[PDB]
Amino acid sequence: MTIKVGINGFGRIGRIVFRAAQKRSDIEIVAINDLLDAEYMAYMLKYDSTHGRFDGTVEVKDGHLIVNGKKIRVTAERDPANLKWDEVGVDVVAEATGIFLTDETARKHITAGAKKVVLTGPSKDNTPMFVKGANFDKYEGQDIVSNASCTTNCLAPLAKVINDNFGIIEGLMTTVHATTATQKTVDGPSHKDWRGGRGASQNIIPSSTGAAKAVGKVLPELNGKLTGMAFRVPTPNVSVVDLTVRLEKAATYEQIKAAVKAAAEGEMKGVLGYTEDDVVSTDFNGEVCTSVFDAKAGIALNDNFVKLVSWYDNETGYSNKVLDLIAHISK
Amino acid sequence: MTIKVGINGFGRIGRIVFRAAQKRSDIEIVAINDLLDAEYMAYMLKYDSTHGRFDGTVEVKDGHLIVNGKKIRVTAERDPANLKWDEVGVDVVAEATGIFLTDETARKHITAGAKKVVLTGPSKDNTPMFVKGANFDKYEGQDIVSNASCTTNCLAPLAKVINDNFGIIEGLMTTVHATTATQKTVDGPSHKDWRGGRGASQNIIPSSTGAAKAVGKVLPELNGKLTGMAFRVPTPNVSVVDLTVRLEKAATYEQIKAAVKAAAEGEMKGVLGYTEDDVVSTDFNGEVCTSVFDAKAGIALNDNFVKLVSWYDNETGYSNKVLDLIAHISK
Amino acid sequence: TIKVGINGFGRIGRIVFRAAQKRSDIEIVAINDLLDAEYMAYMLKYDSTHGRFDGTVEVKDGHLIVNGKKIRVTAERDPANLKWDEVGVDVVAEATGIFLTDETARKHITAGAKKVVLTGPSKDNTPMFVKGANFDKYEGQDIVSNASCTTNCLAPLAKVINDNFGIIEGLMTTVHATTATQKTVDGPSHKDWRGGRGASQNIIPSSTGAAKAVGKVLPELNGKLTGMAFRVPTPNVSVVDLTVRLEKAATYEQIKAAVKAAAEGEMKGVLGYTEDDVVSTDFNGEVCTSVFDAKAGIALNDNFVKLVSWYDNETGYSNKVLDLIAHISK
Amino acid sequence: TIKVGINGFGRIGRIVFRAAQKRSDIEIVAINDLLDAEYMAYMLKYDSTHGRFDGTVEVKDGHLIVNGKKIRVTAERDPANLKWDEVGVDVVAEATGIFLTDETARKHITAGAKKVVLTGPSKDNTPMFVKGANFDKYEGQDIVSNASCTTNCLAPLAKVINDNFGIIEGLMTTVHATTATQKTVDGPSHKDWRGGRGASQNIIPSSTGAAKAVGKVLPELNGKLTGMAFRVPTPNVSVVDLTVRLEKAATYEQIKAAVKAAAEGEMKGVLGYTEDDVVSTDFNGEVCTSVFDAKAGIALNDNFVKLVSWYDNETGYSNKVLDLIAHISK
């Protein structure tokens, strides 16, 4: 018994969610919606500059997508309320347009025949957020949920291990983040973010982010203890969090490493990773773990003040955990 | 007596035209129009990732731009017909939105009080095109003209020298072109150009262009003898034409070089350049010549089949020649 | 099965090794470079361009264990003391870029190898062979060259065009990705001043012999082609830009069909064909040494045409090195 | 006027030379590197990062004529045979990155120079001086170090923060541009495996001593700071990310005012201040070694804050090398 998913929005997250769903036997994509001709959708799925060619076959026949022998209904509806999700039997909608990030706009999917909605971004309202490895057991049957952000999915699991084992007094984070679709190729207008309109490939671009402060929502014990900011850098994919934290209980770096390794090999096997290799960003292109702890890159000034490094494929890891949230609220 | 110019569109070309106008004593910018707050316009003019900080001072006072002590009227009108160009005494409008590239849409500037219009792109209709070094003496008083494209401004002057001296039988051109504002930072929708929606910084992107065929419009003797295509590459600025030509009159490469050098030091001093240095693309960031012939990069198979290389700052060179066309149809 | 030793673990040496894991007829048994097993395992495990190694890598007693196979690791400068016969090497993939002649490569045969394939164009008259071009012209030579990555893209396309329409004369440009010889920022490069400028900032003109080398593997094209290159800020994948004059007048649609027919026929696996809106990254990992881009090309008339063909200058060339190894071992 | 010879014509050596043309108190009279005049003129003429040389460059009798001034060009490996007194060199800008100790740099004084400034952090106890930090602590030493480009950014900001609020402890990250030590594609780097990966593709963690070196130029901060770096695919301009604990509680607005006051006061020209939506390229050519980014920083509370400061790791550091030359010559 497979969970039937419709994808609203075939951007970066929507397409990588689709690609990850082909690998999972418990989740099935049955419908895609975006303002794109079916033939265009096949082209964007077939070819990916970041993640290579689609592993499988995609073709178009009679206005529908054929993906590995499976028929995908393709629609181009602007109003989510006329999506007729019930006609294809969709259980959960992966709302991935980045535009309907509130309970009232996203509820239009449930009106249109869907049973539940997962937002592939942090909610602009109080729609509950859930990060795997952090607070999945706190889901209480809500029909609209958020998977938070790609950056929160990296910070929250690492934060839990550190807090549970040593107690975080206070932490400040920087994410050295890859270029995203909202940026510009050359200096251009970006009214909502002047820095973000500067040429992405030429610049280190500071930006603000609530992802660190949002960790206090999925980890309420850390409610007012985390914040930070971002540096957008000229990479097509893969980012890394730089977490400077104060510890209540004194810990050697060797003890931090052992605590992370244990959680990575234990309760967070699929979410948190651990490495001692001389890794660089491209080594995590395709990583499913939302947080891979970089043991050698981190550094401690003393037993209570430490800087911790954790990688994440902001496309693949987040997309896989979107599916984890789909299945968690269904299974 | 200075020519008063209004700029419609403060994109890449509009801002570099503005910067080039500060260096010319015969051209004055008196008004800028775009859908941008005056403070934002000052920011985009102050800071340029490609060309550095503005050489001078820019500030905003009472909704107006103050640039080196000069007041610039700033408007944000969508309809070019309500631009009230006559209120600021604009003679010529540099139409640089890339959107009103036809006589009927651009004529709205003349209705709005302007006397003449220069399109900073190739016309979508038959609005006459003029390239400096090619056909400025063919201007016959038209009130709406086009400066063609940045690529045509590189190919046309070099084509004239080669044709005048040796006779071009036929030529095929490739422009290895820098990233432009129409491209995307990561794989994304570009309905009018699927290749152009792929991540600009990751890819060599083939594209079509009429710039070579357009040379037959500014150089009618070459009407059906030139065409070609483009490769978009991950550079923020500066492009280069790769011209493979057949010659009627046999010429050694030394004779081609001498003919180009003579025209560069003679009738085309400001338009066509010549170098024998080991130049790379960044060496022409800020180049005013629309075509700098790369002597060492070119290669000949024989005396009638030769490949010629010419650089151009697709932002600075074209912007300077836009001003040359403004002044030519006024002076 | 052919037992292969790789001399030189650079870009070509490492991608050849990765490609060899997919073929059941070729197995790598020894690697030689001045690098030591622990570093080699790291470079093989992690690749910025082609992702993580598909399989398992570990180090044991100064040797590599790769997918359960023990690889001898040596660091010998003189190929004559490489003791290839002690590890049973049949063919040597000479990939240092340094021993590109019959006399230096003969030291591999001296050290116990049977045949040698140079992963570059020969500096002497060592015969060159390109798949799809002249593999049938092999006459049992024990030292051969696989030419260059650019030649492996131009030669198959050139053959189809010449065989079908007759090339009078052609000029080629390869828009080429950044390579290891370039610098990250403006720096000294005595042998090529342009090449020392910052690779990531620049379109850099550079020289190439690949077009005239096509006249060696396709003697009918001797002295009919030349050209040059532009190195551009991409990590991998290049494309040839071939402007040619044709004897027999042909519409561009007729050119397309002739290439497609050869891609689906006599050159399957060597030459590819597409009408899709492809970009460079779509060929990262391409096995075909030449994929014809139908939509990118353009014709001025029926006798003057510009033809575009992609190639992964790492993967495609590396696979054909193995293709030549197996061909000279039959 | 101070007559300067530059040993080493790399990135720092060439940008120091360009910066010296703007100052009337310092003139370059000799350059030494294994490069020859014709190449040096080319590298000086054309720069991918900073544009064409502002002025005229030509070669005459193996020597450089730059803006009408004759520059002696030598290619001496041993600094003791550099004959600095024959060209009247007062101070030597030691910029090879190779002679970073009192005993190797003393060979310059042996060869006729009066004083030496190393354009890097000393490997021995050669005193380090950062403008805005401890220039007033110079006691006439003939060999000094200007520390690193990153130290020149952290030390002035650290001083303002410590002087005003008291730093208990700080951890710093510098998001740093690509440098000449990196590779264009995955390649051998024995001394730093991460550093051999393709610079243009990767965020690359790397080490840095710049934070602890701040404890040397600001002894009050001894053992209170450490950190590391991420090398990113930009050709130039870097930024320090300083997370600090403060003794005296301060709102972020109070921190901003304290930095702005110092930037407009005692550290004018060294420390800068902005509230604009700046990005890295806005500081390509910046003379200030540290420009505080008010909007980029963020505070968790009045005692735990993250501070952002930009630096052109080429231009800013190069200007302060000349600033140290002139300070030790007074």
mmCIF file of N, CA and C in Angstrom, chain A residues 3-34 36 38 40-48 51-60 64-75 85 90 92-96 120 315-324 326:
data_model
loop_
_atom_site.group_PDB
_atom_site.id
_atom_site.type_symbol
_atom_site.label_atom_id
_atom_site.label_comp_id
_atom_site.label_asym_id
_atom_site.label_seq_id
_atom_site.Cartn_x
_atom_site.Cartn_y
_atom_site.Cartn_z
ATOM 1 N N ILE A 3 1.731 5.378 -0.632
ATOM 2 C CA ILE A 3 1.156 6.699 -0.417
ATOM 3 C C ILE A 3 1.196 7.456 -1.736
ATOM 4 N N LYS A 4 0.038 7.943 -2.171
ATOM 5 C CA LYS A 4 -0.075 8.666 -3.430
ATOM 6 C C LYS A 4 0.170 10.149 -3.182
ATOM 7 N N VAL A 5 1.149 10.710 -3.888
ATOM 8 C CA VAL A 5 1.587 12.084 -3.683
ATOM 9 C C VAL A 5 1.372 12.871 -4.967
ATOM 10 N N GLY A 6 0.838 14.078 -4.824
ATOM 11 C CA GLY A 6 0.855 15.079 -5.881
ATOM 12 C C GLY A 6 1.863 16.157 -5.522
ATOM 13 N N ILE A 7 2.597 16.630 -6.526
ATOM 14 C CA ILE A 7 3.609 17.664 -6.342
ATOM 15 C C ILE A 7 3.101 18.949 -6.976
ATOM 16 N N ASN A 8 2.946 19.987 -6.159
ATOM 17 C CA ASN A 8 2.605 21.323 -6.633
ATOM 18 C C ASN A 8 3.887 22.146 -6.673
ATOM 19 N N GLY A 9 4.385 22.405 -7.879
ATOM 20 C CA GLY A 9 5.628 23.129 -8.044
ATOM 21 C C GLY A 9 6.768 22.220 -8.447
ATOM 22 N N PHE A 10 7.261 22.382 -9.674
ATOM 23 C CA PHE A 10 8.316 21.517 -10.185
ATOM 24 C C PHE A 10 9.635 22.274 -10.260
ATOM 25 N N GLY A 11 9.963 23.015 -9.204
ATOM 26 C CA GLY A 11 11.253 23.667 -9.091
ATOM 27 C C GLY A 11 12.320 22.689 -8.652
ATOM 28 N N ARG A 12 13.366 23.216 -8.015
ATOM 29 C CA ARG A 12 14.470 22.364 -7.584
ATOM 30 C C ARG A 12 13.995 21.296 -6.605
ATOM 31 N N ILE A 13 13.267 21.708 -5.565
ATOM 32 C CA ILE A 13 12.822 20.760 -4.548
ATOM 33 C C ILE A 13 11.797 19.789 -5.122
ATOM 34 N N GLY A 14 10.859 20.293 -5.929
ATOM 35 C CA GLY A 14 9.834 19.428 -6.494
ATOM 36 C C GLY A 14 10.395 18.321 -7.367
ATOM 37 N N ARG A 15 11.414 18.634 -8.168
ATOM 38 C CA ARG A 15 11.975 17.631 -9.067
ATOM 39 C C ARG A 15 12.858 16.640 -8.319
ATOM 40 N N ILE A 16 13.597 17.106 -7.312
ATOM 41 C CA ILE A 16 14.444 16.194 -6.554
ATOM 42 C C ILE A 16 13.596 15.330 -5.624
ATOM 43 N N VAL A 17 12.473 15.860 -5.132
ATOM 44 C CA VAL A 17 11.509 15.027 -4.417
ATOM 45 C C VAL A 17 10.995 13.923 -5.331
ATOM 46 N N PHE A 18 10.654 14.281 -6.574
ATOM 47 C CA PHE A 18 10.201 13.287 -7.542
ATOM 48 C C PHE A 18 11.266 12.223 -7.776
ATOM 49 N N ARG A 19 12.523 12.643 -7.941
ATOM 50 C CA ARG A 19 13.596 11.684 -8.181
ATOM 51 C C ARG A 19 13.797 10.769 -6.980
ATOM 52 N N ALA A 20 13.722 11.324 -5.767
ATOM 53 C CA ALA A 20 13.874 10.506 -4.569
ATOM 54 C C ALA A 20 12.706 9.544 -4.387
ATOM 55 N N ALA A 21 11.513 9.917 -4.861
ATOM 56 C CA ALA A 21 10.351 9.050 -4.695
ATOM 57 C C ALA A 21 10.454 7.795 -5.552
ATOM 58 N N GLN A 22 11.199 7.857 -6.660
ATOM 59 C CA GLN A 22 11.372 6.676 -7.500
ATOM 60 C C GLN A 22 12.148 5.585 -6.772
ATOM 61 N N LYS A 23 12.982 5.968 -5.804
ATOM 62 C CA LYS A 23 13.793 5.013 -5.062
ATOM 63 C C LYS A 23 13.045 4.385 -3.893
ATOM 64 N N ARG A 24 11.937 4.984 -3.460
ATOM 65 C CA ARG A 24 11.170 4.507 -2.316
ATOM 66 C C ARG A 24 9.961 3.714 -2.795
ATOM 67 N N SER A 25 9.784 2.513 -2.243
ATOM 68 C CA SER A 25 8.656 1.663 -2.605
ATOM 69 C C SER A 25 7.371 2.007 -1.860
ATOM 70 N N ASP A 26 7.430 2.846 -0.828
ATOM 71 C CA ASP A 26 6.250 3.198 -0.046
ATOM 72 C C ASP A 26 5.618 4.521 -0.463
ATOM 73 N N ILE A 27 6.202 5.229 -1.428
ATOM 74 C CA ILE A 27 5.694 6.521 -1.877
ATOM 75 C C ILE A 27 5.625 6.510 -3.397
ATOM 76 N N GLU A 28 4.506 6.989 -3.939
ATOM 77 C CA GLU A 28 4.262 7.033 -5.374
ATOM 78 C C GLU A 28 3.833 8.437 -5.770
ATOM 79 N N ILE A 29 4.483 8.992 -6.787
ATOM 80 C CA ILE A 29 4.063 10.261 -7.369
ATOM 81 C C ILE A 29 3.042 9.953 -8.455
ATOM 82 N N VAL A 30 1.861 10.553 -8.349
ATOM 83 C CA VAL A 30 0.802 10.316 -9.319
ATOM 84 C C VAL A 30 0.402 11.564 -10.091
ATOM 85 N N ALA A 31 0.786 12.760 -9.648
ATOM 86 C CA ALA A 31 0.394 13.974 -10.348
ATOM 87 C C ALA A 31 1.403 15.076 -10.058
ATOM 88 N N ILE A 32 1.707 15.870 -11.081
ATOM 89 C CA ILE A 32 2.557 17.047 -10.954
ATOM 90 C C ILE A 32 1.774 18.250 -11.457
ATOM 91 N N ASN A 33 1.869 19.364 -10.734
ATOM 92 C CA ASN A 33 1.254 20.612 -11.164
ATOM 93 C C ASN A 33 2.286 21.727 -11.179
ATOM 94 N N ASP A 34 2.359 22.432 -12.303
ATOM 95 C CA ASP A 34 3.150 23.646 -12.455
ATOM 96 C C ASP A 34 2.756 24.262 -13.787
ATOM 97 N N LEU A 36 3.782 24.683 -16.735
ATOM 98 C CA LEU A 36 4.763 24.130 -17.654
ATOM 99 C C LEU A 36 4.076 23.082 -18.514
ATOM 100 N N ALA A 38 3.699 19.615 -20.498
ATOM 101 C CA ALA A 38 4.131 18.283 -20.086
ATOM 102 C C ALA A 38 5.499 17.961 -20.671
ATOM 103 N N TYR A 40 7.895 20.052 -21.375
ATOM 104 C CA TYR A 40 8.907 20.780 -20.615
ATOM 105 C C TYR A 40 9.211 20.084 -19.294
ATOM 106 N N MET A 41 8.173 19.611 -18.599
ATOM 107 C CA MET A 41 8.380 18.889 -17.347
ATOM 108 C C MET A 41 9.260 17.664 -17.558
ATOM 109 N N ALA A 42 9.042 16.938 -18.657
ATOM 110 C CA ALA A 42 9.887 15.790 -18.972
ATOM 111 C C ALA A 42 11.335 16.210 -19.187
ATOM 112 N N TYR A 43 11.548 17.368 -19.814
ATOM 113 C CA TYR A 43 12.907 17.841 -20.058
ATOM 114 C C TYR A 43 13.614 18.207 -18.758
ATOM 115 N N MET A 44 12.926 18.922 -17.864
ATOM 116 C CA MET A 44 13.533 19.296 -16.592
ATOM 117 C C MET A 44 13.807 18.078 -15.718
ATOM 118 N N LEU A 45 12.967 17.045 -15.809
ATOM 119 C CA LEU A 45 13.216 15.813 -15.067
ATOM 120 C C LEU A 45 14.326 14.986 -15.707
ATOM 121 N N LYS A 46 14.358 14.928 -17.042
ATOM 122 C CA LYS A 46 15.373 14.138 -17.737
ATOM 123 C C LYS A 46 16.777 14.651 -17.440
ATOM 124 N N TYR A 47 16.977 15.962 -17.532
ATOM 125 C CA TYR A 47 18.305 16.551 -17.471
ATOM 126 C C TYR A 47 18.430 17.436 -16.240
ATOM 127 N N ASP A 48 19.490 17.211 -15.467
ATOM 128 C CA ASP A 48 19.787 17.991 -14.274
ATOM 129 C C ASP A 48 21.267 18.330 -14.301
ATOM 130 N N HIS A 51 22.581 16.989 -10.658
ATOM 131 C CA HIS A 51 22.447 15.603 -10.227
ATOM 132 C C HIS A 51 22.459 14.614 -11.384
ATOM 133 N N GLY A 52 22.775 15.062 -12.595
ATOM 134 C CA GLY A 52 22.925 14.160 -13.716
ATOM 135 C C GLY A 52 21.598 13.780 -14.341
ATOM 136 N N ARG A 53 21.686 12.897 -15.330
ATOM 137 C CA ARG A 53 20.500 12.470 -16.056
ATOM 138 C C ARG A 53 19.619 11.592 -15.175
ATOM 139 N N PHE A 54 18.313 11.653 -15.427
ATOM 140 C CA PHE A 54 17.367 10.834 -14.681
ATOM 141 C C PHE A 54 17.726 9.359 -14.805
ATOM 142 N N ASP A 55 17.752 8.660 -13.670
ATOM 143 C CA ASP A 55 18.070 7.234 -13.665
ATOM 144 C C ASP A 55 16.781 6.500 -13.988
ATOM 145 N N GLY A 56 16.571 6.288 -15.269
ATOM 146 C CA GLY A 56 15.357 5.712 -15.777
ATOM 147 C C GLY A 56 14.965 6.398 -17.061
ATOM 148 N N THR A 57 13.683 6.278 -17.377
ATOM 149 C CA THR A 57 13.117 6.739 -18.632
ATOM 150 C C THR A 57 11.903 7.624 -18.399
ATOM 151 N N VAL A 58 11.824 8.714 -19.157
ATOM 152 C CA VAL A 58 10.690 9.628 -19.114
ATOM 153 C C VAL A 58 10.253 9.917 -20.545
ATOM 154 N N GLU A 59 8.949 9.832 -20.799
ATOM 155 C CA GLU A 59 8.400 10.227 -22.088
ATOM 156 C C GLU A 59 7.022 10.834 -21.873
ATOM 157 N N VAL A 60 6.525 11.495 -22.913
ATOM 158 C CA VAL A 60 5.231 12.164 -22.888
ATOM 159 C C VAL A 60 4.324 11.476 -23.898
ATOM 160 N N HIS A 64 0.293 13.378 -20.973
ATOM 161 C CA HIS A 64 0.654 12.811 -19.684
ATOM 162 C C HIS A 64 2.126 12.425 -19.668
ATOM 163 N N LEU A 65 2.676 12.345 -18.460
ATOM 164 C CA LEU A 65 4.056 11.931 -18.262
ATOM 165 C C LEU A 65 4.094 10.422 -18.064
ATOM 166 N N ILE A 66 5.026 9.762 -18.741
ATOM 167 C CA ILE A 66 5.295 8.346 -18.533
ATOM 168 C C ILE A 66 6.692 8.236 -17.946
ATOM 169 N N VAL A 67 6.778 7.842 -16.680
ATOM 170 C CA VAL A 67 8.044 7.765 -15.961
ATOM 171 C C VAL A 67 8.206 6.326 -15.497
ATOM 172 N N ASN A 68 9.204 5.636 -16.051
ATOM 173 C CA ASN A 68 9.444 4.222 -15.768
ATOM 174 C C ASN A 68 8.159 3.402 -15.895
ATOM 175 N N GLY A 69 7.397 3.670 -16.953
ATOM 176 C CA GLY A 69 6.170 2.950 -17.214
ATOM 177 C C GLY A 69 4.970 3.397 -16.411
ATOM 178 N N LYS A 70 5.094 4.450 -15.609
ATOM 179 C CA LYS A 70 4.004 4.937 -14.779
ATOM 180 C C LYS A 70 3.468 6.246 -15.341
ATOM 181 N N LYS A 71 2.144 6.353 -15.407
ATOM 182 C CA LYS A 71 1.478 7.543 -15.918
ATOM 183 C C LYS A 71 1.332 8.589 -14.820
ATOM 184 N N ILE A 72 1.840 9.789 -15.087
ATOM 185 C CA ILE A 72 1.751 10.922 -14.174
ATOM 186 C C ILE A 72 0.818 11.947 -14.802
ATOM 187 N N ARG A 73 -0.237 12.325 -14.083
ATOM 188 C CA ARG A 73 -1.097 13.392 -14.576
ATOM 189 C C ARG A 73 -0.374 14.726 -14.454
ATOM 190 N N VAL A 74 -0.375 15.497 -15.536
ATOM 191 C CA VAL A 74 0.282 16.796 -15.585
ATOM 192 C C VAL A 74 -0.792 17.862 -15.752
ATOM 193 N N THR A 75 -0.838 18.806 -14.816
ATOM 194 C CA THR A 75 -1.751 19.936 -14.887
ATOM 195 C C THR A 75 -0.956 21.231 -14.785
ATOM 196 N N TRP A 85 -7.354 17.053 -6.961
ATOM 197 C CA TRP A 85 -6.471 16.018 -6.433
ATOM 198 C C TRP A 85 -7.211 14.702 -6.234
ATOM 199 N N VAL A 90 -4.892 11.422 -4.735
ATOM 200 C CA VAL A 90 -3.721 11.879 -3.994
ATOM 201 C C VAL A 90 -4.035 11.891 -2.504
ATOM 202 N N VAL A 92 -1.344 12.861 -0.007
ATOM 203 C CA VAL A 92 -0.600 14.005 0.504
ATOM 204 C C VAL A 92 -0.093 14.834 -0.668
ATOM 205 N N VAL A 93 -0.111 16.154 -0.502
ATOM 206 C CA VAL A 93 0.407 17.093 -1.490
ATOM 207 C C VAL A 93 1.708 17.676 -0.959
ATOM 208 N N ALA A 94 2.771 17.570 -1.753
ATOM 209 C CA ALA A 94 4.037 18.231 -1.443
ATOM 210 C C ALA A 94 3.983 19.636 -2.030
ATOM 211 N N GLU A 95 3.614 20.608 -1.200
ATOM 212 C CA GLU A 95 3.459 21.992 -1.640
ATOM 213 C C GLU A 95 4.849 22.601 -1.767
ATOM 214 N N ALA A 96 5.336 22.718 -3.003
ATOM 215 C CA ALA A 96 6.726 23.078 -3.253
ATOM 216 C C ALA A 96 6.844 24.245 -4.226
ATOM 217 N N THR A 120 7.154 22.277 1.661
ATOM 218 C CA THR A 120 8.599 22.124 1.495
ATOM 219 C C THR A 120 9.346 23.416 1.792
ATOM 220 N N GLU A 315 19.454 20.226 -1.488
ATOM 221 C CA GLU A 315 18.447 19.722 -2.414
ATOM 222 C C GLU A 315 18.065 18.277 -2.107
ATOM 223 N N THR A 316 19.048 17.374 -2.076
ATOM 224 C CA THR A 316 18.747 15.949 -1.953
ATOM 225 C C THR A 316 18.318 15.589 -0.535
ATOM 226 N N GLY A 317 19.107 15.997 0.461
ATOM 227 C CA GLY A 317 18.783 15.662 1.840
ATOM 228 C C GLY A 317 17.413 16.161 2.257
ATOM 229 N N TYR A 318 17.143 17.446 2.017
ATOM 230 C CA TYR A 318 15.834 18.000 2.345
ATOM 231 C C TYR A 318 14.720 17.284 1.591
ATOM 232 N N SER A 319 14.939 16.988 0.307
ATOM 233 C CA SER A 319 13.905 16.325 -0.484
ATOM 234 C C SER A 319 13.589 14.940 0.068
ATOM 235 N N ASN A 320 14.616 14.207 0.503
ATOM 236 C CA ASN A 320 14.390 12.885 1.075
ATOM 237 C C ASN A 320 13.613 12.975 2.383
ATOM 238 N N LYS A 321 13.892 13.998 3.193
ATOM 239 C CA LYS A 321 13.202 14.149 4.468
ATOM 240 C C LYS A 321 11.793 14.693 4.293
ATOM 241 N N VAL A 322 11.535 15.413 3.199
ATOM 242 C CA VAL A 322 10.161 15.735 2.828
ATOM 243 C C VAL A 322 9.350 14.455 2.678
ATOM 244 N N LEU A 323 9.910 13.473 1.966
ATOM 245 C CA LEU A 323 9.254 12.178 1.822
ATOM 246 C C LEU A 323 9.160 11.452 3.158
ATOM 247 N N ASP A 324 10.166 11.618 4.021
ATOM 248 C CA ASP A 324 10.086 11.035 5.356
ATOM 249 C C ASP A 324 8.921 11.625 6.139
ATOM 250 N N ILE A 326 6.132 13.022 4.699
ATOM 251 C CA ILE A 326 4.951 12.460 4.039
ATOM 252 C C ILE A 326 4.590 11.116 4.661
#
